[PDB]
Paper text:
Our structural and functional analysis of the chaperonin ɸEL from the bacteriophage EL of P. aeruginosa revealed that the protein is ATPase active and functions in aggregation prevention of denatured proteins. ɸEL forms tetradecameric double ring complexes, which dissociate into a population of single rings in the presence of ATP and at physiological salt concentration. As anticipated, the ɸEL subunits displayed the typical three-domain architecture of chaperonins, composed of an equatorial domain (residues 2–130 and 425–552), an intermediate domain (residues 131–188 and 388–424), and an apical domain (residues 189–387). The domain structures of ɸEL differ from those of GroEL by numerous insertions and deletions, which alter the putative substrate-binding cleft and the contacts at the ring-ring interface. Our functional data rather suggests that the chaperone mechanism of ɸEL is encapsulation independent, and represents an evolutionary precursor of the more complex encapsulation mechanisms used by the group I and II chaperonins.
Residue numbers in the entry:
A (entry chain M): 94 to 186
B (entry chain M): 466 to 549
C (entry chain G): 4 to 289, 295 to 549
D (entry chain A), E (entry chain L): 4 to 549
Amino acid sequence: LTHALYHLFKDFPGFQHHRNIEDLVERVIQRLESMAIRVEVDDPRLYQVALTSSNQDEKLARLVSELYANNKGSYPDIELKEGVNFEDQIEQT
Amino acid sequence: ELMRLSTIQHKLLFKDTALYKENGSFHFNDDWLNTPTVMNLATGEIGTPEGLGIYDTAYASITALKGGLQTAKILATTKTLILG
Amino acid sequence: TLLVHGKDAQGIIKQVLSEVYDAVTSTMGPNGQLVMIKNGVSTKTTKDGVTVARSIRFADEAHELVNRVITEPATKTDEECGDGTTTTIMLTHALYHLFKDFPGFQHHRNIEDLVERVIQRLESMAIRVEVDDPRLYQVALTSSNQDEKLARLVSELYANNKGSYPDIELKEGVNFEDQIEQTTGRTIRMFYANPWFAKGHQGGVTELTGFTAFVIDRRIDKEDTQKLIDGVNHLVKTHKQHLALPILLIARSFEEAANSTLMQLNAAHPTLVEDGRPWLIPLSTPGTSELQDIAVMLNAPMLSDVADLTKLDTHSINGQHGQLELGGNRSILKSTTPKDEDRIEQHARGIEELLEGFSLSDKFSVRARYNERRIRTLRGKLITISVGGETYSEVKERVDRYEDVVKAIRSALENGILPGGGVSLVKAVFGTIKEGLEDKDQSAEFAKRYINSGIANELMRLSTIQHKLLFKDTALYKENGSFHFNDDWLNTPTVMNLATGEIGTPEGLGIYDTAYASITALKGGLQTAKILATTKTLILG
Amino acid sequence: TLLVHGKDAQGIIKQVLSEVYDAVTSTMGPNGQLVMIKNGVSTKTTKDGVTVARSIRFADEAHELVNRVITEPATKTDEECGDGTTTTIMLTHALYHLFKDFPGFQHHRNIEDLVERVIQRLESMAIRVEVDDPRLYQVALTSSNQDEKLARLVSELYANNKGSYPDIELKEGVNFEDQIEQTTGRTIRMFYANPWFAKGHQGGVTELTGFTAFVIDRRIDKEDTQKLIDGVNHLVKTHKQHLALPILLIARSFEEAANSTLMQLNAAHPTLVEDGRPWLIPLSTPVGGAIGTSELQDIAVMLNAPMLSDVADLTKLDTHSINGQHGQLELGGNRSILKSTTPKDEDRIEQHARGIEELLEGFSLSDKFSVRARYNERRIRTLRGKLITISVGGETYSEVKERVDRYEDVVKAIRSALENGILPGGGVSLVKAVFGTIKEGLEDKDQSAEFAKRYINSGIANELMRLSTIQHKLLFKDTALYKENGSFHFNDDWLNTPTVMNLATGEIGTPEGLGIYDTAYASITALKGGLQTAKILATTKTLILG
Amino acid sequence: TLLVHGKDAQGIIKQVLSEVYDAVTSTMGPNGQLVMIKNGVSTKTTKDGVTVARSIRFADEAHELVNRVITEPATKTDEECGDGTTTTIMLTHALYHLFKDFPGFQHHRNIEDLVERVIQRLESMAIRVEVDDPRLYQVALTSSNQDEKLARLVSELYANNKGSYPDIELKEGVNFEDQIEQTTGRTIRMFYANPWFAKGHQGGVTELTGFTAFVIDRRIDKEDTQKLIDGVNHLVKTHKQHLALPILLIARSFEEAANSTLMQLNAAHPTLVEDGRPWLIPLSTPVGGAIGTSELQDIAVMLNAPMLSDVADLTKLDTHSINGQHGQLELGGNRSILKSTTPKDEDRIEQHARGIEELLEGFSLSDKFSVRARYNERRIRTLRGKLITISVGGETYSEVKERVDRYEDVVKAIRSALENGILPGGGVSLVKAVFGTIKEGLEDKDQSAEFAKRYINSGIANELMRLSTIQHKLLFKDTALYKENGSFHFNDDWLNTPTVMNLATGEIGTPEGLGIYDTAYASITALKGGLQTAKILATTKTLILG
């Protein structure tokens, strides 16, 4: 965006144009801040983000999403350790 | 000119694919704002980001525009470099 | 020799087009700079767009090869109209950047199509000015470099002669004041084949009060020498009773082999010689239908072959008793009887009826304009102005300034008038965008091709270029960084008279351009831009 | 001078071929670029493959030496057909890389034999179009650079004259509109043996209104000098009463020994000379062979001349054999032109034309596509052909002469279309030929054992399939065929129903459906000539500059 | 420093890959050239692919930057297996040219999937050789550079010990002849957690004649520090009577937080210290996963140690659970070695070994070739393996150490032959795998539609066939296979009965007939690693030197 907006300033030179650019871009920023979806803990959209980030893992995206969803009221801090078994083991405290 | 700049990211992501296939370059309209068009690179399908599942973090995209604006303005308005 | 291919050829093209642009554009406006051209051991200092363009040279063969494509089509080929050379180079540069900005064959077929629709609007927007209309003075004032005396005189010459279009010639006079010579006579394109056939046998001005003309079509050489001997002796022997001397043999071209034969044929019959005057004169013309006009004026029959002179009769042969003035440069008719003027006017109406039944696009073509040139020859008066001044150099410069005024006013009445100051192109672009977008039938297609692409918006920015160069560094571009057009400005445009120093409408102030010049600039600018954009290879061998 | 041997010669050859390839191929396609050629103190800007190829020069002698081998055979020698120069240079480049990839004399003899079988498939695949068939319009439209007016007019001229094949000449007109002049006149392949026998004694265009022709078969040299003296003086003395001057001695060839004898024979009888015109004219015809014998028989029938085997047969003649015509003939250094033909003569010509037609009616279907049938059709067309002179017009001088050239391209295209044939355009006919030849050899179980070892297992067959694609690629890259993936690939199904793109309209379909065609002779000769030049370049190891 | 972007980056990568290819490939074949390497003030002259690869250097930083990506993955990281470095560079160069020839992300995702299916065929094709099978001699003969004496001796050592897999060490001898020392002793995968716990407190080789081992499963860190203090002090106080020092705490991993605690616990009881030897030693094993759990069970059975899940289980113990051995053990930083095993202990080990064997007896034929069965076999071999020390001799000093290396190559080859597998050598197995995969996909009528579109019609399938030939070409060029024509070409029949040449003898036959074999693990890993490095090089566009 730096590269993009740098060309916009060189394309409309002079101080009078600059104050117009800066004001319009500022109003765009106020739209993105309004368009933003502040997602809640219970909301099932987290699964879609989890499914994308885990390289299409059906098992992992379900478990981590449930860990957040079940604890409705407290934001869980997660630590990871190299286990021993084939299966995973969870220790909630 | 500002409308042309917003396209830059969508261009770099989905150039050399089946969105820019019918003509020389893909162009947005009034209808595409209600139901956007992308491409899932893993699967190979065309749809809406809401449908397919492509999302970004809001704070990252917002701060990119704010920080991009300030650094752009400085570079545009600099006329002197002191190396001493 | 070397062969240039790829990014390098497109690199050369861009550089040459840039340098030509800068040199030619700086000439325009109130801060119009001056160009200093070397010729031999002298110095010519001017601000004439054409003269600058004609004289730009480059050292490199590659650079010069390109230079002959951007200047020379509007420089060497453009001999009939000098004006609109600055404008063509200007639009070429503009439209070149438009083609580079939207690459690929699919965009190009869209650009070429929209620009073609803009051309159709300008051809419609043209105001067909009348002879009596006072607007001609405003056009005369602008073209004469703000001359109050000259613009008044030339405007009056056309205004006073309401009904006939005056042909104006210029000669270098002797006095300080100007002298006008008005004559009610027609000018013909025929002239002597050889100086021997004139009065005094040395290319003089032969005046006649009777003749019998014959118009041949073919170019005459050594092959037609026998056909002339058979032809001439047939009329002199058989049809001498109904024959007024001299016999005028009008044709396309007379070669020296044929001219020498016709000299001896004059000597063959010495009885018909009156006061030195030869009774047979060959006459050449520099376009088949121009000889048809020549035939109608002098009651002459049209003949395809030279051998057709034998098979003739009293019905075909018609000897006139008017008044003609033959010349080495041109021939001049004077005395035309009411019987002859009926034949000329009827023939003129026949050409006019052909122009009435053509399309609007073909009215601005070479076909229609040549047919109008036919009419004006068939119905025109001759005026000879002898231009004067204080020195020798001041006279010949004033001669050129008169010639620019004549060329401007002729083309003003002929072709049309459009609002000057880079306004007619802005109105045409903004008009065509709005028309296509507002028309709900094709609005779906129009938006996809031009509007959503950004072609429509980029084309609006181009039309502004001329208005910018004319009125930058002035009180229009004072309020903000740059002046921007709106919806309201199309109805009532805004310019500045540089002579006075006032703001108003081109209609109010009086700034106009010739329509044919501005239209040809856009047509020729589009073609040359497209070629330059699409060239990838230069061959120097 | 210098002598280049080894890896450097092959180094230069590769570079020059590369540069010429790039310049000439960039001309092709919808994104067809433009070449800006310098000539004197002017600039010619064009996209014509032949004009680009003719004008490429190099500074180094070694580079220029090679340049005359790749361009000049399809440039300087190719005078009859202008089209198929971009095709030849393209195929040369492709096949050169095929010879380099499979080196050694054993592979080379296998490449040459497979390409030879592809050539045999193209000649089989050729569609012989008829005069009435509307496909000619599509050929006319493509060759005219998408002209709606010109393609309609020229296609009508051939279609309206159903029975006679029109010969079209072009002249620079005067008006804005075009003007057509139709004349019932024939073109003959006879021409002057020596310039002396013409009007003005310097190879001029002699016009005649009466003659007495005699057709000899033999090639005439120093051995027949005595037979001519006995022959000519027999007719001039005995049979002068029933003889219209001049006497035309039509033959195969007149050598300079015989021509000098007949010059003196004209001087022997000065009484029969009228206005400079020699009363005896020898006339040669470029034919050769016993196929070529029957063209003189056509010449004999047109002018009511007797067919004579020997020169000594001129002595034994009579009023029944000798027939002096009183029509109109125009002799020329390039060709002779007949004009005035009486109704009595046209009965003899049409009867002789029917005799050739009846021979074609009683042959097999396979032999109708042969050289024998097509030559016999060329005989008919000469015997029933009309002269048309079109005077092309326009707005300026330059627009006229450019339109003249655009007319000439359309005439050349339609002539060769009816003459030779039609193939599906868009680089499709070569793909169908290769993919056909490989499938035929592999499927044929008799020679499948040998065919697999030579072509299939080697990878020659597979590499040859990739080369046929080259033309189709250059035309339809950067368009909606190459959109779904990185590159378009042909399959088994596409051979039955091919896929192209009409660049004017913007639609996808079959060449048969849309209407894109090429002349068969151009595409066939390009493959033949491209193969030969490729072989030479690949096999050159030495350059001598002295 | 400089930044390289665009066509220059791909320009450098192409050049460095070319030079490394030329330098390493020239080593292979009967006309196998020799490389002369400078080291200090001496000269090493060799035809060893790995040693050539490790030693190639460049002057420019950009060049050396690229050079570390092509060599170093199969050079510095590959410490366990030296063989298959020439092969990996070879395939990298081949597969790089494939990725350049079919550019674009859609083609690339297809190439990667096809090569993946070739890999699956090679893993299926592998012949699992048995100990008694005479084929091992052919493998030994090829790996020893045609040594008749050595290949006989090493093959006999494995063949005579039918039941136990011998571990072989090598030492520089004194005599001209070799001397063999056979010992009934086991090698264990346990080693020191910290160097402090060894003899001399600096990671020495501690020899013992009595111990009491305890096997823990968990990975030990700062969390288990309290559990160790409670555990160790419980046994030292309560169960001291039936305890032979030292106490060995075998586990998965000991972190530095736990090691420092156990150092202080040794200092807590100074009465139990004998001649410097610490009475408590933590011992780690590199396993991981639930497959890896059962290796500690083998460790437990060998030393009569109880299996413990938690560290806190050390408290709840008794005379029935605690068992102190009085054998002989040799602890080490690399590995531990058992020696003295009483007849009572060998009964327990053999009974446990039979339990693993019985599990393998009751599985399907397909699962016998899996990772599960082969790991369970690796368990048995550790539980029943004997130590052999060969002292290699010769005429000089240099001839001995060279013969030591030649022995080590033969041992590595025979170990991996029995372990992983055997494939037909001479670049035959790759050609069989590719031609197999294409034929299987094309012949299978279900997916034939998709398979033809992606691979066959594209020309990927055919281009991949040409690559597999590369190894066979380098080996048997300039010989009587490539004699009849310019180049040898494979067919359908040659897949059933392949054709090579024995370079020692000079005869033509099948690899099965003549006796040319390769280790399966080396050939598979070369294809896997060659594909990954090839992809990276083809898709790199930028070099940062700062």
